[PDB]
Design a protein around this motif. Sequence first.
Motif, PDB file in Angstrom:
ATOM      1  N   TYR A  38       0.745  -1.258   0.000  1.00 52.04           N
ATOM      2  CA  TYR A  38       0.000   0.000   0.000  1.00 52.04           C
ATOM      3  C   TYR A  38       0.786   1.327   0.000  1.00 52.04           C
ATOM      4  N   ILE A  39       0.396   2.189  -0.933  1.00 45.07           N
ATOM      5  CA  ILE A  39       0.843   3.567  -0.992  1.00 45.07           C
ATOM      6  C   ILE A  39      -0.366   4.426  -1.451  1.00 45.07           C
ATOM      7  N   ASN A  40      -0.486   5.620  -0.860  1.00 48.90           N
ATOM      8  CA  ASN A  40      -1.530   6.588  -1.217  1.00 48.90           C
ATOM      9  C   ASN A  40      -1.086   7.330  -2.488  1.00 48.90           C
ATOM     10  N   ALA A  41      -1.350   6.641  -3.597  1.00 52.32           N
ATOM     11  CA  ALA A  41      -0.947   7.027  -4.930  1.00 52.32           C
ATOM     12  C   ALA A  41      -1.941   6.372  -5.873  1.00 52.32           C
ATOM     13  N   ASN A  42      -2.364   7.073  -6.919  1.00 53.68           N
ATOM     14  CA  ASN A  42      -3.170   6.480  -7.978  1.00 53.68           C
ATOM     15  C   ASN A  42      -2.579   6.763  -9.351  1.00 53.68           C
ATOM     16  N   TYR A  43      -2.744   5.806 -10.259  1.00 53.56           N
ATOM     17  CA  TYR A  43      -2.543   6.070 -11.684  1.00 53.56           C
ATOM     18  C   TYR A  43      -3.666   7.007 -12.154  1.00 53.56           C
ATOM     19  N   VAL A  44      -3.311   7.859 -13.100  1.00 56.56           N
ATOM     20  CA  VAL A  44      -4.205   8.893 -13.564  1.00 56.56           C
ATOM     21  C   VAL A  44      -3.801   9.054 -15.010  1.00 56.56           C
ATOM     22  N   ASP A  45      -4.797   9.107 -15.891  1.00 55.90           N
ATOM     23  CA  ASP A  45      -4.534   9.248 -17.297  1.00 55.90           C
ATOM     24  C   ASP A  45      -4.004  10.619 -17.624  1.00 55.90           C
ATOM     25  N   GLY A  46      -3.368  10.682 -18.786  1.00 56.90           N
ATOM     26  CA  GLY A  46      -3.074  11.929 -19.449  1.00 56.90           C
ATOM     27  C   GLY A  46      -3.832  12.026 -20.745  1.00 56.90           C
ATOM     28  N   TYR A  47      -3.354  12.924 -21.593  1.00 50.76           N
ATOM     29  CA  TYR A  47      -3.863  13.061 -22.955  1.00 50.76           C
ATOM     30  C   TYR A  47      -3.314  11.968 -23.896  1.00 50.76           C
ATOM     31  N   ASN A  48      -4.239  11.202 -24.492  1.00 48.60           N
ATOM     32  CA  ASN A  48      -3.891  10.127 -25.397  1.00 48.60           C
ATOM     33  C   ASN A  48      -2.987   9.036 -24.786  1.00 48.60           C
ATOM     34  N   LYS A  49      -2.986   8.918 -23.457  1.00 49.23           N
ATOM     35  CA  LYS A  49      -2.118   7.961 -22.768  1.00 49.23           C
ATOM     36  C   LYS A  49      -2.727   7.571 -21.466  1.00 49.23           C
ATOM     37  N   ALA A  50      -2.953   6.269 -21.333  1.00 45.09           N
ATOM     38  CA  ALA A  50      -3.370   5.653 -20.089  1.00 45.09           C
ATOM     39  C   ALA A  50      -2.206   5.621 -19.100  1.00 45.09           C
ATOM     40  N   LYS A  51      -2.530   5.893 -17.845  1.00 48.54           N
ATOM     41  CA  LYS A  51      -1.576   5.841 -16.748  1.00 48.54           C
ATOM     42  C   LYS A  51      -0.330   6.722 -16.973  1.00 48.54           C
ATOM     43  N   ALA A  52      -0.563   7.956 -17.449  1.00 45.60           N
ATOM     44  CA  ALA A  52       0.507   8.916 -17.735  1.00 45.60           C
ATOM     45  C   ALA A  52       1.124   9.452 -16.454  1.00 45.60           C
ATOM     46  N   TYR A  53       0.305   9.557 -15.410  1.00 42.74           N
ATOM     47  CA  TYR A  53       0.741  10.051 -14.127  1.00 42.74           C
ATOM     48  C   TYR A  53       0.533   9.050 -12.977  1.00 42.74           C
ATOM     49  N   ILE A  54       1.420   9.082 -11.954  1.00 44.67           N
ATOM     50  CA  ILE A  54       1.058   8.668 -10.573  1.00 44.67           C
ATOM     51  C   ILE A  54       0.817   9.964  -9.787  1.00 44.67           C
ATOM     52  N   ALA A  55      -0.423  10.155  -9.315  1.00 41.44           N
ATOM     53  CA  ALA A  55      -0.747  11.255  -8.389  1.00 41.44           C
ATOM     54  C   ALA A  55      -0.787  10.715  -6.949  1.00 41.44           C
ATOM     55  N   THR A  56      -0.061  11.372  -6.058  1.00 45.08           N
ATOM     56  CA  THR A  56       0.234  10.806  -4.745  1.00 45.08           C
ATOM     57  C   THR A  56       0.357  11.959  -3.762  1.00 45.08           C
ATOM     58  N   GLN A  57       0.182  11.641  -2.482  1.00 44.58           N
ATOM     59  CA  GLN A  57       0.476  12.588  -1.410  1.00 44.58           C
ATOM     60  C   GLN A  57       1.955  12.970  -1.230  1.00 44.58           C
TER      61      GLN A  57
END
Length: 553
Positions: free
Chosen positions: A75-94
């Motif tokens: 466990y980590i307080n982080a999610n995958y988050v899409d970008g433009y034309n790309k799945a899982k472009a970001y990890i957004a996290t605390q």
Amino acid sequence: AIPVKQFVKHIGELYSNNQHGFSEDFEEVQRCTADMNITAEHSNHPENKHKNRYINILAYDHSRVKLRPLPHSDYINANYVDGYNKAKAYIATQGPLKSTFEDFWRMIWEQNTGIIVMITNLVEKGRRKCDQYWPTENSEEYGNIIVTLKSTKIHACYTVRRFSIRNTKVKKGQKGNPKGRQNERVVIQYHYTQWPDMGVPEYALPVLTFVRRSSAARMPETGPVLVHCSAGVGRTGTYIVIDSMLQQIKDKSTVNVLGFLKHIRTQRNYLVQTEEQYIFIHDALLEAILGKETEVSSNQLHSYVNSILIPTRLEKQFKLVTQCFSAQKECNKEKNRNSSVVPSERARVGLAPDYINASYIMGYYRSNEFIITQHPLPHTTKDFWRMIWDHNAQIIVMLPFVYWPSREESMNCEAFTVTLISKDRLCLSNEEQIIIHDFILEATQDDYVLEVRHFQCPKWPNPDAPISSTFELINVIKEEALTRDGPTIVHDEYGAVSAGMLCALTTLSQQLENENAVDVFQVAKMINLMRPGVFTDIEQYQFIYKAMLSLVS
């Protein structure tokens, strides 16, 4: 969903009728996942409780980044988050915690992440917002990952830190390898340092510059870009949406804030967090569409200058530079020499106990590098020195009435005294002189002493020396500033063109020097945003181009 030509008009309709469109939209974003019953059970598990910064800010189970198990370790307080034309472009996290530093760097190794965007300071307004998950210098150990600081590049609004990370439990590879050792990778942290602790940024320009540079730093065949703040939702989501929409505009010439934002709220909660943040996305993207792009490399500067002078792109830039203040405005108008040149509210220099006609102005390395002010009036001399004192300013550039003390009589300001300690002069190219006076301000009810150097400059710029000699005086001030702290006070009569030109040309020459690039419009726009009526004629603006051109050699 919205062609980019409809955007000027689109934001106008969102702003209209007491901003009812923004309000509706953001309320729609707020309610758009309620019915989906998205769970966050691992976030809420008692054993992971210490690994969450805030009780209310969770990582949804379906999109949460999972750590490989170790002999709830996943466990980590982080999610995958899409970008433009790309799945899982970001990890957004605390913002990581001391208890989660290992997990954080492990996740960066495991996900093949090469970029970190940090949009927070550590401590903001007396409140801990993020722990320091990187070594101040040299190296530090976070479980199996050794993180080494390789370099630090400081700019006014953000700092870039180059790290090499080494995973000790990973094999080194083949010796001939052009990519280097395979248990080592580079991570670049793009850290925005000027985000207000309250609300949204006053100016979209330095944020747009930060988004653009941090984003273009994504290399191919790389893992997700990691974006965090404190909670990892508001500033983080803001970034992700301006970035993604910056890229959508480039590719389709459309913009899709609402639909894209509603999508990513399925991925992490409280992306983006406030209606004011929502509005700032729109403001900034509009500002992006309309301001063109103005940063120009050294080897393109001559040609760029040529084509902006032909009918003209110079004229259209300058109308945007001169588009540009409540307290000034005032029971304070007898403290102003000319109330066409006054500070904005945001950039106003306050006197500790209110008003002085002075503005904070940004430099290359620091926001608030300069204070542009007016020549002190006799009834404004106490206030002027109170500003020096309050801001611990050690340099005054005067660009042409003596408002400074003589050897005979010290100056008494209640809290401190001003005393001349020596007078002197520097020489320049055309037998021109800078007169120097050195003052000490001594506290009257404390023992602090502040050393302040005063430069009385010749007429500057000198219209009958080569234009490149404009930088001689700039270079003398730069070299003094290196040895001193606090802001540099620059004044002419009103705090107008000559004052601004010293600040603009200092900034732009530090940019050319450090980046082999120049952004005249941005530097000039920011000076005028922070103090209306500094640059008023197009010839002053053209001279910034011509002057910077003379250094490109």
